[PDB]
mmCIF file of C-alpha atoms and ligand atoms in Angstrom:
data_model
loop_
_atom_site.group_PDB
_atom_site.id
_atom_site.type_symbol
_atom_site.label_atom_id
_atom_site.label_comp_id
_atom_site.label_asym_id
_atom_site.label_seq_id
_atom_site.Cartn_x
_atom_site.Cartn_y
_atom_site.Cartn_z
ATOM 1 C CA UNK A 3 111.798 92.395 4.014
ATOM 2 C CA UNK A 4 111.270 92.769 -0.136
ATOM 3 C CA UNK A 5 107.844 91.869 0.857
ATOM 4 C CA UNK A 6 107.800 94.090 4.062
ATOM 5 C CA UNK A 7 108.496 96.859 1.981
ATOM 6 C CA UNK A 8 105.780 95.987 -0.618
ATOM 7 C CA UNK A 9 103.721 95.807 2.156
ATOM 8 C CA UNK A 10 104.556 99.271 3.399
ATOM 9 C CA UNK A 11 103.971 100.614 0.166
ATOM 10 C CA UNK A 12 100.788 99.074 -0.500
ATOM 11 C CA UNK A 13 99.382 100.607 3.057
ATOM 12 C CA UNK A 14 100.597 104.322 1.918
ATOM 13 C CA UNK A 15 98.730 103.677 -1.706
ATOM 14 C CA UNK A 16 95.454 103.020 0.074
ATOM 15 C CA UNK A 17 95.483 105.811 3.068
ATOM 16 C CA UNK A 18 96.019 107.469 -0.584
ATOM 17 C CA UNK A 19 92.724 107.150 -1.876
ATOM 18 C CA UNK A 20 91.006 105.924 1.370
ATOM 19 C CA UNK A 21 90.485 102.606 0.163
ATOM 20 C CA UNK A 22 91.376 98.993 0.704
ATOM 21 C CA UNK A 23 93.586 97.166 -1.630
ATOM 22 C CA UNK A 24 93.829 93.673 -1.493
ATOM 23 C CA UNK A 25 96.957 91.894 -3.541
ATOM 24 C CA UNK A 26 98.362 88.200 -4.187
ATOM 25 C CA UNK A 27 101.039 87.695 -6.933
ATOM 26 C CA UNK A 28 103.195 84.301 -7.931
ATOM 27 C CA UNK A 29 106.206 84.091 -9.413
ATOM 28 C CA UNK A 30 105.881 80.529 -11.338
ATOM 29 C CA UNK A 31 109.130 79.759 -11.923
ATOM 30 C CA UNK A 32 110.475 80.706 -8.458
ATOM 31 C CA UNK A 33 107.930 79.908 -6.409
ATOM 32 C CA UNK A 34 107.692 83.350 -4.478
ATOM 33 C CA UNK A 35 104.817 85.024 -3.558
ATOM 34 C CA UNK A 36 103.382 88.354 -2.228
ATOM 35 C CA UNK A 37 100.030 89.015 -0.038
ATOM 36 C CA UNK A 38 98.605 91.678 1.372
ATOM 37 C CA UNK A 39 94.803 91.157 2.780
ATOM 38 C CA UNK A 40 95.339 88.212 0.605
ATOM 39 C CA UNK A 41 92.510 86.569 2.647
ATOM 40 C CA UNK A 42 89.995 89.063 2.854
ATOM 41 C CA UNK A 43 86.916 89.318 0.670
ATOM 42 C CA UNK A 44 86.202 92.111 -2.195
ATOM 43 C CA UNK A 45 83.704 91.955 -3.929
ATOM 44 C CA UNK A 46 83.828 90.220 -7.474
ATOM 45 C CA UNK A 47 82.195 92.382 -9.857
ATOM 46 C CA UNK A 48 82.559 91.561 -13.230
ATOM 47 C CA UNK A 49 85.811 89.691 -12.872
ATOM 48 C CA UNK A 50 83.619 86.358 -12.414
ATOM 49 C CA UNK A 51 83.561 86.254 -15.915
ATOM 50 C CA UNK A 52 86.872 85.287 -16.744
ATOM 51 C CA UNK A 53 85.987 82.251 -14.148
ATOM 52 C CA UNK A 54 82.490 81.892 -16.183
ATOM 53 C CA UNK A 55 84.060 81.437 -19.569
ATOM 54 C CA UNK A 56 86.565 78.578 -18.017
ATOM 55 C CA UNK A 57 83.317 77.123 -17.184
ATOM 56 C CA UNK A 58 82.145 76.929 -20.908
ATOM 57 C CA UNK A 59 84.948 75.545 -21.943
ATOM 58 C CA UNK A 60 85.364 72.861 -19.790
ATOM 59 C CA UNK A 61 81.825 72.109 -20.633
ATOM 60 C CA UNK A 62 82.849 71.938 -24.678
ATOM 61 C CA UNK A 63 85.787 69.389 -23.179
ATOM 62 C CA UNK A 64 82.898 67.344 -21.791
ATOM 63 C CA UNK A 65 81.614 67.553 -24.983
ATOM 64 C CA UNK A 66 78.006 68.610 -23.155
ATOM 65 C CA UNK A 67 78.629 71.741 -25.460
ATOM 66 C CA UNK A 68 79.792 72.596 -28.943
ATOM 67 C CA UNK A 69 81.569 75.928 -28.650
ATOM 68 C CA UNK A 70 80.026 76.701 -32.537
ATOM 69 C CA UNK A 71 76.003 75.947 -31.445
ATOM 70 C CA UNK A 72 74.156 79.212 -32.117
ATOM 71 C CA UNK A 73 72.613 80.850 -28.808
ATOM 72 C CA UNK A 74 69.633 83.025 -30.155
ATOM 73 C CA UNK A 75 68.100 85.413 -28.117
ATOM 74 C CA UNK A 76 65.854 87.701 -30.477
ATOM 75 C CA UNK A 77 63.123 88.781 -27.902
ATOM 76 C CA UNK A 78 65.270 89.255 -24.954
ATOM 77 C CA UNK A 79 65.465 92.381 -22.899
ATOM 78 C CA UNK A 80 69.419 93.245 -22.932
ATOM 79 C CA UNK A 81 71.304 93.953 -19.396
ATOM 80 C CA UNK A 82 72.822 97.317 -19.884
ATOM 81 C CA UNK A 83 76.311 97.158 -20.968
ATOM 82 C CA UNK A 84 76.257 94.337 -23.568
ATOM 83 C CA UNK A 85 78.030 96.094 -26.331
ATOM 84 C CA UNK A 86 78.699 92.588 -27.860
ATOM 85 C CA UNK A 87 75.255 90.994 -27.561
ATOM 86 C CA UNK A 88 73.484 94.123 -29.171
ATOM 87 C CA UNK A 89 75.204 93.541 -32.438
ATOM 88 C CA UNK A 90 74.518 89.954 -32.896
ATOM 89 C CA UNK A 91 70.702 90.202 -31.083
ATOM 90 C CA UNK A 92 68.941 89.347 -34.651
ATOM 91 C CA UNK A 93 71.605 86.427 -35.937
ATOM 92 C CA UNK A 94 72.477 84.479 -33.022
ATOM 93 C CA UNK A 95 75.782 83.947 -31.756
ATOM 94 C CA UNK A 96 78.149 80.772 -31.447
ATOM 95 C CA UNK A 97 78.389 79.925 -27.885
ATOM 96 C CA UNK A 98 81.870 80.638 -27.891
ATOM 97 C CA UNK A 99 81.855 84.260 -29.113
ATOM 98 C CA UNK A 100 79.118 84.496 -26.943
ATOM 99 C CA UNK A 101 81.376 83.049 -23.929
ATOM 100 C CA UNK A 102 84.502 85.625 -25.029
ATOM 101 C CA UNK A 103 81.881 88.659 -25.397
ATOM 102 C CA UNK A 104 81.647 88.328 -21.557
ATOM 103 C CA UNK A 105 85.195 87.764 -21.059
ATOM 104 C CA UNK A 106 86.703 90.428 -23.423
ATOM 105 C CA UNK A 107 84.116 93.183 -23.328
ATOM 106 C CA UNK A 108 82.104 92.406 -19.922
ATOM 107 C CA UNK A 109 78.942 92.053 -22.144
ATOM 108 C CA UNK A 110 75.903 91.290 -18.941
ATOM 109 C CA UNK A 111 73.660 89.889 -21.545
ATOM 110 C CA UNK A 112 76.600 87.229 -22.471
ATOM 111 C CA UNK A 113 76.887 86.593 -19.455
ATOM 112 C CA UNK A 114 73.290 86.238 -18.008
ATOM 113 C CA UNK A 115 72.090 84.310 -21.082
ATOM 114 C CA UNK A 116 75.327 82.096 -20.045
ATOM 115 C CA UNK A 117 74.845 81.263 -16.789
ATOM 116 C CA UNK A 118 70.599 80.661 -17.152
ATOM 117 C CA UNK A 119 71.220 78.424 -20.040
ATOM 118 C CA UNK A 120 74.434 76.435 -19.493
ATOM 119 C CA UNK A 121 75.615 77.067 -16.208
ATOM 120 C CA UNK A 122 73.557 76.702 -13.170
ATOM 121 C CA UNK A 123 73.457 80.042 -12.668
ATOM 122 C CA UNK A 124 74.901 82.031 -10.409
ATOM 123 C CA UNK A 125 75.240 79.032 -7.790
ATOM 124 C CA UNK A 126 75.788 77.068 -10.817
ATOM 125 C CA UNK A 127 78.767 79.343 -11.296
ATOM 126 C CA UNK A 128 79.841 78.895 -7.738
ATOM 127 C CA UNK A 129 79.520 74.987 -7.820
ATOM 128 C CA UNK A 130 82.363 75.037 -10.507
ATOM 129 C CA UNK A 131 84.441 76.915 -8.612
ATOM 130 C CA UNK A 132 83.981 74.556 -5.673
ATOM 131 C CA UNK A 133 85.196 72.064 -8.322
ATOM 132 C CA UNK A 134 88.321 73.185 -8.759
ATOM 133 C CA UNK A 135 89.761 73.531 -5.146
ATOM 134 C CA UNK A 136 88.429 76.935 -4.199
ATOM 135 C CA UNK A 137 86.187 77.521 -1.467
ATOM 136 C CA UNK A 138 86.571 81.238 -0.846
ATOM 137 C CA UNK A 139 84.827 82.589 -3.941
ATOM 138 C CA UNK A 140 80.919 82.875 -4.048
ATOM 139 C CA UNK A 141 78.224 84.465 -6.713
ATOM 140 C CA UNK A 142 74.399 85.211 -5.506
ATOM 141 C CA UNK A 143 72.970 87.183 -7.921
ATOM 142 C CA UNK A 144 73.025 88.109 -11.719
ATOM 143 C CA UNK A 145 75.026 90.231 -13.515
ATOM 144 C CA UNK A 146 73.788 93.449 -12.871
ATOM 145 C CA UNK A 147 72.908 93.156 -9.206
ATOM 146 C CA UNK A 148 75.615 91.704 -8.107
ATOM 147 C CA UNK A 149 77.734 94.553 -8.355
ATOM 148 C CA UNK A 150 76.447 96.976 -4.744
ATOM 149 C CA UNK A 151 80.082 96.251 -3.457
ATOM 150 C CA UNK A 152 77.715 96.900 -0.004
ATOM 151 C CA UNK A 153 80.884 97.650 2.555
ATOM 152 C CA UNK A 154 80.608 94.320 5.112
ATOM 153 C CA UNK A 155 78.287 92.535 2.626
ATOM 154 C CA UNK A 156 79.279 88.592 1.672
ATOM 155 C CA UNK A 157 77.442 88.157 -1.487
ATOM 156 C CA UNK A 158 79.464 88.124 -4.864
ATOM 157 C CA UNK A 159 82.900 88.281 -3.257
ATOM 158 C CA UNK A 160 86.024 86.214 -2.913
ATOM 159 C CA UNK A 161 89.959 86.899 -1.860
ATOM 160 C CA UNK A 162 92.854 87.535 -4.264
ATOM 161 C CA UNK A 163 94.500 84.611 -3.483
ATOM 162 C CA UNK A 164 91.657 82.349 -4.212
ATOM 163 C CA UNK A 165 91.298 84.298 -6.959
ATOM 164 C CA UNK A 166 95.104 83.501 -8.415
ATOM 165 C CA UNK A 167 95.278 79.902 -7.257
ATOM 166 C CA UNK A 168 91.597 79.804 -9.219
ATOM 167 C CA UNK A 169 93.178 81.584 -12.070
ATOM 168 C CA UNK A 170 96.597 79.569 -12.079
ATOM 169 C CA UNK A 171 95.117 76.183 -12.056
ATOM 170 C CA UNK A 172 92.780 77.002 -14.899
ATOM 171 C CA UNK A 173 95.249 79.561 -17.337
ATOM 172 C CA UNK A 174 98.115 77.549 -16.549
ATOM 173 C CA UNK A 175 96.976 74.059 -15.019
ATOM 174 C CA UNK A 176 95.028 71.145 -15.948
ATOM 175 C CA UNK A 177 91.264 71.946 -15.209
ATOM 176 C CA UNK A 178 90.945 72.365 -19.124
ATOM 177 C CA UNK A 179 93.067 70.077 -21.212
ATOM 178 C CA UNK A 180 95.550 71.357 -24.358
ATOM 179 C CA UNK A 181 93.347 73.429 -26.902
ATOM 180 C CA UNK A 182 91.012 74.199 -24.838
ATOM 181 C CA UNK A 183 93.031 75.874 -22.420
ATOM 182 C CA UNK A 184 95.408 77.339 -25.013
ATOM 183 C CA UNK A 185 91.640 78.652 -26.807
ATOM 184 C CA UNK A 186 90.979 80.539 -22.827
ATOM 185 C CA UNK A 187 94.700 81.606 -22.942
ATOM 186 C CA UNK A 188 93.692 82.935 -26.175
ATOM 187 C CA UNK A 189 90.686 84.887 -24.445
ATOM 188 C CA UNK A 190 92.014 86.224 -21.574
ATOM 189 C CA UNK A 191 95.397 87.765 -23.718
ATOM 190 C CA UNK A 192 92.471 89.876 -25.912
ATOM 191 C CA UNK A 193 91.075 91.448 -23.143
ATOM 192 C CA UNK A 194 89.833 94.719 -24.065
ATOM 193 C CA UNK A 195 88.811 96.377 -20.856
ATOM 194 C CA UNK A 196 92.073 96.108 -18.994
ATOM 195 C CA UNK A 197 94.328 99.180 -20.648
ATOM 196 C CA UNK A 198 94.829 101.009 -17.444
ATOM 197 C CA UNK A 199 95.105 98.360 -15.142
ATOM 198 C CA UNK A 200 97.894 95.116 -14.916
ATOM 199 C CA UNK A 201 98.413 95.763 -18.722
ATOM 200 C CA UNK A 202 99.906 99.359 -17.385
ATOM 201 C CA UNK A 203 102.091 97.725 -14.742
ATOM 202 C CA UNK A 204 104.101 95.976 -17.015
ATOM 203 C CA UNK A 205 106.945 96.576 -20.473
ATOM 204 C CA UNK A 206 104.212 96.487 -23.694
ATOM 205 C CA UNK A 207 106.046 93.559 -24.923
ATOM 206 C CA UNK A 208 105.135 90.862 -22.235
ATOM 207 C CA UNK A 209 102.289 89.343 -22.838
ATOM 208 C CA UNK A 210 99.087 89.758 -20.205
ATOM 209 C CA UNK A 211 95.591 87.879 -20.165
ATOM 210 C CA UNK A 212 93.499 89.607 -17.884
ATOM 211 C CA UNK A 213 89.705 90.254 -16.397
ATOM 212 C CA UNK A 214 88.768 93.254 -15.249
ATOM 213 C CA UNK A 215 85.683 94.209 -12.902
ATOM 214 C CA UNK A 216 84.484 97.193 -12.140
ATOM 215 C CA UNK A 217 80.726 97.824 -9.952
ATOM 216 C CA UNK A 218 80.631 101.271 -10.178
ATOM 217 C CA UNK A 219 80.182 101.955 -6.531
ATOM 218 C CA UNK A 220 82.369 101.915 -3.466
ATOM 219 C CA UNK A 221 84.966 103.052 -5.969
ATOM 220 C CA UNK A 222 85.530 99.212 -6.484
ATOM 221 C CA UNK A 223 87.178 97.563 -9.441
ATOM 222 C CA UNK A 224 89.498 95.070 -9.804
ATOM 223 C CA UNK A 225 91.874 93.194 -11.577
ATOM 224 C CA UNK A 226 93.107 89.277 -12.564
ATOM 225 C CA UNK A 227 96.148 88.634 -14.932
ATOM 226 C CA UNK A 228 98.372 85.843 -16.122
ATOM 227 C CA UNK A 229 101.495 87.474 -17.670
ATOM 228 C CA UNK A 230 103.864 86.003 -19.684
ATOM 229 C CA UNK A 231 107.772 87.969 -19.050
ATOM 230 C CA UNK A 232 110.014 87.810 -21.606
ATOM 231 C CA UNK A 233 112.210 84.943 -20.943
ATOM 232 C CA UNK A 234 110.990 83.799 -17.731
ATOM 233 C CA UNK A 235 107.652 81.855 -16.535
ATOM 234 C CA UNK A 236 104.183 83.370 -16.123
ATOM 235 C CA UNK A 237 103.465 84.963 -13.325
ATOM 236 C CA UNK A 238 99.618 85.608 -11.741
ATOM 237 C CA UNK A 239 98.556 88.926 -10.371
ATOM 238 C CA UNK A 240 95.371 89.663 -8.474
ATOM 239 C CA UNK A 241 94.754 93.255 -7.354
ATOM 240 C CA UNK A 242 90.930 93.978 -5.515
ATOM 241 C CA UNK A 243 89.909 97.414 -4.171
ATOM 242 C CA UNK A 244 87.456 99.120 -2.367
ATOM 243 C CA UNK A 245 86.648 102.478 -1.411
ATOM 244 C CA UNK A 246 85.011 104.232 2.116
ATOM 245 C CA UNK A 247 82.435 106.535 0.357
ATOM 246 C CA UNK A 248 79.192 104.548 -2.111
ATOM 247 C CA UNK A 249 80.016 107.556 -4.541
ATOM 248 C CA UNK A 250 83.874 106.875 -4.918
ATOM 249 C CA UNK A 251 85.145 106.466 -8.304
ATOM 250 C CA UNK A 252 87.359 103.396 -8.510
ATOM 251 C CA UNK A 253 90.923 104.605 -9.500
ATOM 252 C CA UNK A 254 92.948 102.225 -12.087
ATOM 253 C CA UNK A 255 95.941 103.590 -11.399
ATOM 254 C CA UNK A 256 95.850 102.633 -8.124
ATOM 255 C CA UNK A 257 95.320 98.811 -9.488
ATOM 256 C CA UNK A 258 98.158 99.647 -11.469
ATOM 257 C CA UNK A 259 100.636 100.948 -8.978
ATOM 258 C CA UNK A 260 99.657 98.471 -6.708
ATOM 259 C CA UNK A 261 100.515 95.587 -9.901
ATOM 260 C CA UNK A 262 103.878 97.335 -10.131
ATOM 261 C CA UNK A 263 104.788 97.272 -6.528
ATOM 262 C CA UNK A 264 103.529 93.661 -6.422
ATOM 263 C CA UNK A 265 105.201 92.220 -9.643
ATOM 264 C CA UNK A 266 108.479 93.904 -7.744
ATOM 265 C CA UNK A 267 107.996 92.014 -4.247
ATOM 266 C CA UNK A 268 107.896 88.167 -6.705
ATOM 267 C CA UNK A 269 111.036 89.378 -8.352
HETATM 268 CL CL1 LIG B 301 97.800 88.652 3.227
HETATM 269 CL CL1 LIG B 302 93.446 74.322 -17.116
#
């Protein structure tokens, strides 16, 4: 009934803004959970990236990678929206700032450079996930394109939950061994596009990895967290929404009302 009433509240917050939220949250050190259209598919937007840099590192682990190789790209044609990149276009960067660029920042450059040279691209992307247990999520297209949020369309989507259990095994698992998973810990926690979103849900003192996404239509953005409570285990939070009209603006406070109501129906 804790979760009934979550539920409830949820279902007001997107008659609200005429939306569709989807939620899953764990409690890791009690087990409970909370779902609401845990199991249907949003679109991804950029939130793949947080999934993408896991990738990297687990490729450094194979040692197919050194996360301090310079990735040059002088002559390339930047995706909009790569603060990071743009800086560093005439030098080079290491592979891992260039990984955490598309993490921290949602650089498209990062990230496209990324997935063409290391990754496989975007099926690339989606064989990894495959690897690790998850067969809901799926990538099609490159950074840019990938984020119509078409209403009804499959490509670039996946559910909140497969989105937690994705995030648990590899923030808090065993996909990624000890420094390299404390390193992504280390990424996710210096997030810098997450402010109004599961960050906002929560007292300023516990500590919160996140990725955010954000397609700029369908009002859809999105949000993934770890969070560390004070005195208590981590918890993961997954929050997706969509909106009715192409011209909606996506609404973080939304995301983070619907974090709160979540993180209180774990508790
Ligand atoms: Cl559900
Ligand atoms: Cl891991």
């Amino acid at each position: 009934n804790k979760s009934d009433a979550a539920a409830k509240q949820i279902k007001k917050l997107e008659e609200d803004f005429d939306g569709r939220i989807g939620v899953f949250a764990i409690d890791t050190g009690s087990g409970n959970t909370f779902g609401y259209r845990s199991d249907e598919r949003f679109p991804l937007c950029s939130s793949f990236k947080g999934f993408l840099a896991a990738a990297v590192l687990e490729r450094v682990q194979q040692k197919k990678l050194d996360i301090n190789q310079k990735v040059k790209y002088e002559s390339r044609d930047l995706e909009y929206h790569s603060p990071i990149t743009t800086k560093y276009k005439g030098s080079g960067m290491t592979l891992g700032d260039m990984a955490s660029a598309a993490l921290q920042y949602s650089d498209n450059g990062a990230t496209n450079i990324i997935m063409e040279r290391f990754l496989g691209g975007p099926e690339g992307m989606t064989k990894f996930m495959r690897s690790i247990g998850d067969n809901e999520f799926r990538l099609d297209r490159w950074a840019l394109e990938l984020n119509t949020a078409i209403p009804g369309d499959k490509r670039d989507t996946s559910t909140p939950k497969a989105v937690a259990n994705s995030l648990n095994k590899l923030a808090l698992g065993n996909v990624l061994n000890a420094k390299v998973k404390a390193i992504y810990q280390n990424w996710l926690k210096g997030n810098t596009t997450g402010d109004a979103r599961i960050r906002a849900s929560v007292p300023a003192d516990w500590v919160v990895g996140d990725k955010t996404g954000s397609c700029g239509a369908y009002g859809t953005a999105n949000d993934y967290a770890v969070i560390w409570p004070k005195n208590r285990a981590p918890l993961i939070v997954s929050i997706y929404t969509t909106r009715k009209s192409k011209d909606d603006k996506h609404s973080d406070k939304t995301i983070a009302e619907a974090s709160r109501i979540a993180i209180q129906a774990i508790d």
